[PDB]
Subunit: 208 residues, 4 copies
Amino acid sequence: SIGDRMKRYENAYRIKLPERMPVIVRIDGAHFHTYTKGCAKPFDQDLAEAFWETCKYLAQNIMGAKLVYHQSDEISILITNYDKLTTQSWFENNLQKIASVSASMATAKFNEVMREKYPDKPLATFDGRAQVLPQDEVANYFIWRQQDASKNSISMVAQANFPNDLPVWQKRGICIIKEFYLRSRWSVDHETPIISKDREYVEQFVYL
Amino acid sequence: DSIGDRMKRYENAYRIKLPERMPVIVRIDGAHFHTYTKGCAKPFDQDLAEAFWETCKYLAQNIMGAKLVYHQSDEISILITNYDKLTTQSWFENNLQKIASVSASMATAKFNEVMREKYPDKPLATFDGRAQVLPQDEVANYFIWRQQDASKNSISMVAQINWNDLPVWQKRGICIIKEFYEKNRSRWSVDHETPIISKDREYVEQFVYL
Amino acid sequence: DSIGDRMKRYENAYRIKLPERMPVIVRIDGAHFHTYTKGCAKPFDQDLAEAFWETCKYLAQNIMGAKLVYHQSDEISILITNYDKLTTQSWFENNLQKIASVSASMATAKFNEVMREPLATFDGRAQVLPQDEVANYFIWRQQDASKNSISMVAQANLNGKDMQDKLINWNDLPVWQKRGICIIKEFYEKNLRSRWSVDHETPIISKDREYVEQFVYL
Amino acid sequence: SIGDRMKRYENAYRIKLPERMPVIVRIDGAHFHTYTKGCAKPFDQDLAEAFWETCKYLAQNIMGAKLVYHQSDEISILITNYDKLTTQSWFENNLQKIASVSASMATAKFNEVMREKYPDKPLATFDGRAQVLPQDEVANYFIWRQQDASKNSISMVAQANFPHWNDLPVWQKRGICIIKEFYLRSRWSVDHETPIISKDREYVEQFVYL
Ligand SMILES: Nc1nc2c(ncn2[C@@H]2O[C@H](COP(=O)(O)OP(=O)(O)OP(=O)(O)O)[C@@H](O)[C@H]2O)c(=O)[nH]1
Ligand SMILES: Nc1nc2c(ncn2[C@@H]2O[C@H](COP(=O)(O)OP(=O)(O)OP(=O)(O)O)[C@@H](O)[C@H]2O)c(=O)[nH]1
Ligand SMILES: Nc1nc2c(ncn2[C@@H]2O[C@H](COP(=O)(O)OP(=O)(O)OP(=O)(O)O)[C@@H](O)[C@H]2O)c(=O)[nH]1
Ligand SMILES: Nc1nc2c(ncn2[C@@H]2O[C@H](COP(=O)(O)OP(=O)(O)OP(=O)(O)O)[C@@H](O)[C@H]2O)c(=O)[nH]1
Ligand SMILES: Nc1nc2c(ncn2[C@@H]2O[C@H](COP(=O)(O)OP(=O)(O)OP(=O)(O)O)[C@@H](O)[C@H]2O)c(=O)[nH]1
Ligand SMILES: Nc1nc2c(ncn2[C@@H]2O[C@H](COP(=O)(O)OP(=O)(O)OP(=O)(O)O)[C@@H](O)[C@H]2O)c(=O)[nH]1
Ligand SMILES: [Mg+2]
Ligand SMILES: [Mg+2]
Ligand SMILES: [Mg+2]
Ligand SMILES: [Mg+2]
Ligand SMILES: [Mg+2]
Ligand SMILES: [Mg+2]
Ligand SMILES: [Mg+2]
Ligand SMILES: [Mg+2]
Ligand SMILES: [Mg+2]
Ligand SMILES: [Mg+2]
Ligand SMILES: [Mg+2]
């Protein structure tokens, strides 16, 4: 056949992550330094809330999503596929499919939320990447990301003053977690802890 | 720094790059469109395709190395070359995940924007993207394999009356190509006179063998 | 310099690395060993087996992070851990093509020196496993080892249980003829020394999972 | 079953090279700086002669092998798999299988040849890597290695007389090649008249462009 030939060229880059391992997917904004030219400083409230709604939507549509952390213009999502013994994988851990769909989902909701408040704003695009992490390295990832949060935070505030203790999401970002009330829901945790002081906040979704 | 170096190695473990100076094909297919096209008209919705055609142009405009964009059903195939000269650079330096995700993202934002207008309240449409490389002699055969699947889907959609009288886009899908016009220049435009590539192979190979 | 950078980009396109701090398994199967073992005894050749046992030792003595080397038929599996400490380095920095080739190269180098008393060649592949699957791997190889052994004895001269039922006691046969064999580091006294030994009393991993899990969990 | 799940982990690193494309395989000696301690300087005949035979054995067993180039302790091999429309790739372009069996092949033979003259010599080991190249670069690759071989040749010769030339044979100056020779029988022989590729581009491209 010729479909066998063409599909063969395709499969040469059909990469699959090994299963039963933590999966972290990061979605950073594409050229947001130009996109946030009209946004306010040091932090834009409307811009931050757009991510929060976007993070929920991602968590609501991604199989195995347990935790979503937001900062600056990036979104990181912890995905587990070893909850039970027969737990299925999202797209069978198809590397390209995970990175693209997540980016696509984060692109759809973010735009539709932003355009409601800003109908003249240009389209916003996102890049996505996937990776695996050993269990003992999952908490260290979000710590490393949160240390990047605070560093960027103090740099953004000091840039206004010359060339004390801001709110939570302005200091170390926030997370979107599962909440119970018996039904399940995702909600923005404004009381986000410093992960280095409360590692179990992440590890509760890692070791299970 | 120290902790960032360790984390980067895990990330770089799946930092795959496509080899340079080779034809690149990015296919962007719509996720769960069988559910999404519930309200759309059968067998051919002119507004459904027009939203794709507006997206195809958007993709070709922003994707570095874009030469041709063939549309069919719910999928979009983009041909990319990075060997136009010796100083030619690749899109995102041929980062596999980045090309696949940015493309699927660009396709998503433009499609929803067009569809939102004149259809208020429609559910969000999403896309998945994949990248690959092809030897020059196989590039034409890729589109033929795609143009053949189009006609297969076309006649099967008509069934569930002359088929050959139907428009070229309903029968064989429609490519979009950079057209040259005079004003005061280049311009991406939809080719409604899209030929049967199996017959006219140079229609695609013209961008391949540069 | 400039040209070299260009070529390297093509080469680096397939410089793939396994994620670190994760159990790495390397399997080395023989190439065309059906032809190679023509002069060898059936169902089992003692001289052919002992060569692998020396090869497994040679490998373990040289693979950085090697903890367990299981032998069976014409295959050689090796458990490699790189998370023993906090500053534990990875063999070749987990370069996939490298550890797959140097392994096969090593096994080739020794297996020919021993047997020279044609040429045998090998293939090598590497992968990572989650901690709770390492045990299941060697079990899978060991269970496969038994099936081949029962099917080999029955031959000269349907299901595996049916063949065992008919056929000369099979359980009377030694361990290596039954469920393959492992080689591990043993600690002995000759005055507190250490060496890689061929564990002739290799347990059924399905029964004794800790036999392998001791190398997976610190 | 458990067998299906286990093969799944394995398949996660069962990488395949794209087909209909030049495949270059490089085989380099592992820590030969130690192995060649007993060997002469700057150019050891018996060491190089062992590689020449190894290059024969490699080309005699690699499906699609066209050209083999020897330098220092490395061995490069050009592999095409598009000579015909039905040409099959070696090991179906399995990256790990190509890389490993190649190095295993080299190791098995190199130790056999070297043992004839040096029975006291320790075991030699090789590492193998595999890649693909667009046709434009195949000649360039071998030039890159050959220009590298020339640099080292001049420097190493300069080591013996001063601390810190064209009269020397070809292999001591710019390495050597192994091509299939026709005499109607065929055989892989050592081209002792191996040209400077940068001048004779067709010497390599003749296997590339078919
Ligand atoms: N004013 C304002 N700018 C922000 C805010 N959050 C993110 N940004 C902008 O987003 C950028 C984040 O860093 P990057 O993601 O590396 O910037 P980039 O130009 O998008 O680079 P790429 O991610 O590679 O596209 C910063 O430079 C800021 O200018 C915000 O809350 N307010
Ligand atoms: N009404 C209408 N439906 C279409 C049109 N084009 C494609 N479709 C629908 O899209 C489907 C194409 O098959 P798929 O691409 O596999 O549909 P899918 O649900 O997106 O499945 P995935 O490819 O896995 O994402 C067909 O079954 C059609 O029902 C169109 O032009 N008009
Ligand atoms: N220009 C350039 N040359 C390199 C680079 N890396 C290695 N080389 C040279 O290219 C030659 C090819 O031999 P290799 O075995 O691939 O080099 P290497 O440094 O050992 O690379 P590894 O074996 O993967 O560790 C070596 O002699 C190096 O000196 C590079 O990144 N850029
Ligand atoms: N007579 C005999 N043959 C053996 C013995 N051990 C292994 N073999 C041979 O080794 C083979 C093991 O299966 P494979 O590894 O698939 O054989 P292969 O020919 O190397 O196939 P590939 O691995 O794909 O190259 C059997 O077919 C046997 O013929 C032995 O102890 N005695
Ligand atoms: N359950 C299961 N078993 C498999 C599968 N593939 C291979 N096996 C068995 O597992 C054993 C592993 O041997 P391999 O080295 O992979 O031999 P192979 O099947 O030729 O694989 P390659 O040499 O890479 O082509 C084989 O003897 C097969 O009988 C699979 O997909 N599922
Ligand atoms: N005496 C002698 N030594 C040689 C000759 N050719 C190569 N060598 C040795 O082979 C070595 C090749 O160096 P590299 O390939 O860059 O690295 P390596 O020493 O093999 O170590 P690795 O590549 O990391 O395994 C040189 O350092 C030389 O010492 C030769 O003709 N005569
Ligand atoms: Mg980025
Ligand atoms: Mg950004
Ligand atoms: Mg950022
Ligand atoms: Mg679809
Ligand atoms: Mg489709
Ligand atoms: Mg076998
Ligand atoms: Mg096999
Ligand atoms: Mg074998
Ligand atoms: Mg090297
Ligand atoms: Mg070397
Ligand atoms: Mg070398």
